[PDB]
């Protein structure tokens with residue numbers, strides 16, 4: 338209770354494993370990443386799919 | 387960010403001394419002096 342102001346859309350929600358808010362989820366899903374090799378990808382490159 | 391050979395992983399948390407990768411750092415500590423890796 339913050340005097341009638343609700344910050345529920347900008348405060349984090351602990352249900353999902355990444356503690357991220359609703360607006361931050363919208364901002365993350367809106368920008369389509371290049372899916373670069375910040376996580377390792379030589380296993381995906383060696384396996385010819 | 388790849389993988390480490392020669393540094394053991396401890397279940398603690400300190401300030402980042404040597405930056406390695408996605409939230410993982412390394413340091414030279416005592417608890418015999420050795421290189422440890424942590425978050």
Ligand SMILES: *[C@@H]1O[C@H](CO)[C@@H](O)[C@H](O)[C@H]1NC(C)=O
Nearest residue numbers: 338340341342343344345346
């Ligand atoms: C604030 O917003 C959430 C979701 O939009 C809602 O559940 C909550 O009741 C709102 N707060 C108030 C005081 O109405």
